[PDB]
Each structure stands twice: as structure tokens, then as C-alpha cells.
Amino acid sequence: TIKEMPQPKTFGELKNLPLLNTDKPVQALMKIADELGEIFKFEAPGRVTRYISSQRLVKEACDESRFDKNLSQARKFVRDFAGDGLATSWTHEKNWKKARNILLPRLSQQAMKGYHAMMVDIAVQLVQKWERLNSDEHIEVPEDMTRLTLDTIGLCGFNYRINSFYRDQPHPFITSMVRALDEVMNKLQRANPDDPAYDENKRQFQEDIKVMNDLVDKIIADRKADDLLTHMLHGKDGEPLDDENIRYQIITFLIAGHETTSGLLTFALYFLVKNPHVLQKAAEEAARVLVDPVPSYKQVKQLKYVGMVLNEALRIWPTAPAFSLYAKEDTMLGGEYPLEKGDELMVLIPQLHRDKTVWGDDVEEFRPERFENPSAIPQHAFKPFGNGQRACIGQQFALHEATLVLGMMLKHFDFEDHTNYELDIEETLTLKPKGFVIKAKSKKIPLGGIPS
């Protein structure tokens, strides 16, 4: 009762690779897996991957006795600029689990009691910039969501003030990060990599890894002249971290610790303007809960419905959209698809969150009240933060940051979807709505003990 594995139209020496000559590869890999089922094979020269989309199979892949963690084929390149160091190392690494058990305890729920104040500091900045737009003026959502999420990691994680809001044009580091990823992403759709046709391109990329390093120089310099870098320097295990691997860990968290989080907020706010009854309902929760000008740690933990709106928007659109895995031994999967040792499966997350056998037929509706009883979401049907001993380390940081902010936004403004924005999701590894803009009617509620 073995079953042959599916596969998209191959085109020659290229195999299936030319089905990814598009700038929305994930979005297209869910049209493929949309037809070819819960699993389908994917060959591009000298690399093969299986794509699992059903909870039925994901729940096996996450069985850590069968499967270990893997580097996306995107990850080995984003390793040409990150780890050895957490988000781009294999479990079989030394400056992984040492590099993780220095930081893990700094990222718990309890550790957020400490970051909370600086998180509220950057949040106030974003709210007030909106209080001070002219009439005609609209909001660039993903654009301002980045201003925040980045400032906030820089500041909680590295006690450095990036002052992203004191700048009309996206911070250098972000313009360069974006252009560094689009490369990694196209250098993946490139049929002949080592070519001179791509030559102005791997020198561009280097200029960009310099701008990004600039800001990293600036953050260490500022420290010399209990943050997340106070350990990344003086945290033992039993080895503190070394010369070279620390400027890695830094660029690693400046990226991981904001991008995916900016994604989640643009998406949530999108979904809310399109479902104005959910906006209304979280807008009340926020009014009812945040009764001081600024929120307390205590208060942010009681934005229950807002936590829910975040998870729902994370179901419908995981911003870190896929994670990889390898087989630890030869094995059946599903009892049908037989894998060798080392074979690679990719967890197409946005599709797993659309598995109707686990969710309903309304998998495409925005309904935050699914997450009322979170004991109702089945084993493994939901994983925006990866799975297992390599779950997203910064999940509790992300969710607190994101609730706090979505919570304040909804306390001080009504938003109008003024352009009838039709969704367009730019892909730079991670997903984020592109050119999403709205207007905000302020509720004229004072903040900080400051009027406007």
C-alpha cells in the first residue's frame, strides 16, 4: 500500500525550478500543493525537497525521534551571512545549543516584565506620529510597522536607540537588508549560479552586508561607551561567546527579531479593516482594558481578544512561512511515501493552516474566536513558530510586542480602509503586505499624560 509521490511539470535540465521564476514563490507553491495534494516532490538541479501541507503528515514530521531540523535551501545562503548562531545552525552544532541556552532565559514570559517599559517607549513613538499626520495624509502600514519592530529589538535586545521614527526614509539597514534577501531569494531561482551574468550582483550584496554591519559596529561601540547583548557577551553555559560568532548573533537578531514581527502587524491590521466587526470588538477590549495613558505589563496580558486576532492573522498568513526538516533514519511517512535517511521535508505553513480536516471549511475567513479555547486547536495544526526543540525562540517577545502595539493602536484610533486596498503580498523570504495604506481617525485620547 505504498504510493508514488507527485510532482509539478518538469522542464528539462531545469526540472521544476522554472515554476519559481516568480517573485511570489511561496504563494505559488501553495497553488501547486493546492492541486497536487498534501505532499509533492520538488527537484531543482542537485537538490530535492518534499512539501508537506496536511496536519496528518506534519504531525509526523515534528516527531523529533524521526526527524531533525534542516537548512531551507534559502537558509544555507542566509548562512553566508548569519550563523553559526541560532536561526541558521543545525541541531548538530556546538555554537547552537550553547548559543541558545545563554539567550533562552532572557526571552521567557517573565523576561518580558523587564523589556515591557522600552517596548512601550517605542510604541508611544508610533502612535504619536500618527496623531500628527495632516488630514490628506495616509499611513504606510508595513513601512511604519518596520520602523517600530526594528527600533524595539535594537532597544530591548541591544539597549541601542536606532531612532527609526526620526527619519523620513526607511533606515539604511532595512533598505540594504531587503536588497540582501531578494538576492538570496533569486540566487535560489537561478539555474546557473556561479555566472558572470549575475556579476554586478554579488558585489552589490557585499555593499549591503556592509551597511548592515555598520549599524552592528555602532551598537557594540555604544555598549562600551541587563540587555540581550549583556549576555551575548558575558553569559556562560560552560563557555561565553567568542570573538567572531557574536557579530553574527547580532545581525541575526536585528533581522529575525523584527521582520517576521512587522509582517504579523501589517497582516493583522489588514484583516481588521476588512472585517470591521472584529476591529470594533478588539477596539472595545482595548478601551475597557488600557485605562492608564500607557499600558502596564499586567494590562497587556489581559488583551485576550487581541492576542486572538494576532494568532488568527498568523494562521491565515505565517510571516516566516516555511521551515525545513531531514529524516534521521529510513522510514515510511503516512505509510505511503517512503523516505531515505537524510531526505528533506518542508513544512508549507500557510497551507497547513488551511487544512479543512483540522479547521473547518471556513479556513479562509478571519475569525479570531477560534482561539477562544486554544485547547481546541489540534495537535500540530498550527505552527507559525516552527516546532519542537527549535521553536521560534523569540515568540514571547514577538507576541507581547505585537499585542501591546495592536492594543494601543485600537485605543487611540479608528482606521478607514480608504483605497479599498486589494491584498498584494511581497516575498523577501518572509511574507508582508506590500503598499498597504490606510487613514486613521484619532479618538483624541491623551497618551503619556500628553494631549492630542
Active site residue 392: yes
> Does 320 interact with ligand HEM (rule: CB under 6 A)?
yes
Is residue 113 within 8 A of residue 297, CB to CB? The reply is yes
Which of 146, 252, 260, 403 does the annotation list as catalytic? 260
Report, in Å, the least distance between residue 64 CB and ligand HEM. Answer: 12
Does residue 120 belong to the site contacting ligand HEM (CB under 6 A)? Answer: no
Shortest gap between Cβ of 162 and ligand HEM (angstroms)? 15
Q: List C-alpha distances in Å: 348 to 29, 54, 148, 186, 366.
A: 8, 9, 28, 19, 20
Map residues 81-100 to x or -, x wherever contact with ligand HEM holds by CB under 6 A.
Answer: -----xx------------x
Q: How many residues does the chain have?
A: 452
C-alpha atoms less than 13 angstroms from C-alpha of 75 in its C-beta half-sphere: 20
Instruction: Indicate if 156 belongs to the active site.
Output: no
Task: Please provide residue 432's backbone torsions phi and psi, each rounded to the nearest 5 degrees.
Answer: -160, 130
* Cα–Cα dist 396/449, whole Å: 29
Residue 318 touches ligand HEM, criterion: CB under 6 A: yes
Tell me which H or E stretch contains 434: none
49 is catalytic: no
What is the spatial order of strands in the sheet that 413-416 belongs to? Answer: 139-140, 437-442, 413-416
Interacting residues with ligand HEM between 245 and 264 (CB under 6 A): 253, 256-257, 260-261, 264
- Give the active site residue among 62, 267, 371, 392: 392
Among 160, 371, 385, 415, binds ligand HEM (CB under 6 A): 385
Question: Is residue 69 within the footprint of ligand HEM (CB under 6 A)?
Answer: yes
Place of cell 485620547: 445
Q: Residue 107 CB, nearest distance to ligand HEM (Å)?
A: 7
Task: Tell me the number of residues near ligand HEM by CB under 6 A.
Answer: 24
CB of 192 to ligand HEM, least distance (A): 28
SS3 annotation, 274-326: HCHHHHHHHHHHHHHHCCCCCCCHHHHCCCHHHHHHHHHHHHHCCCCCEEEEE
Supply the residues annotated as catalytic: 260, 385, 392
Q: Which residues would be at the binding site for ligand HEM (CB under 6 A)?
A: 69, 86-87, 100, 253, 256-257, 260-261, 264, 318-320, 323-324, 384-386, 390, 392-394, 397-398
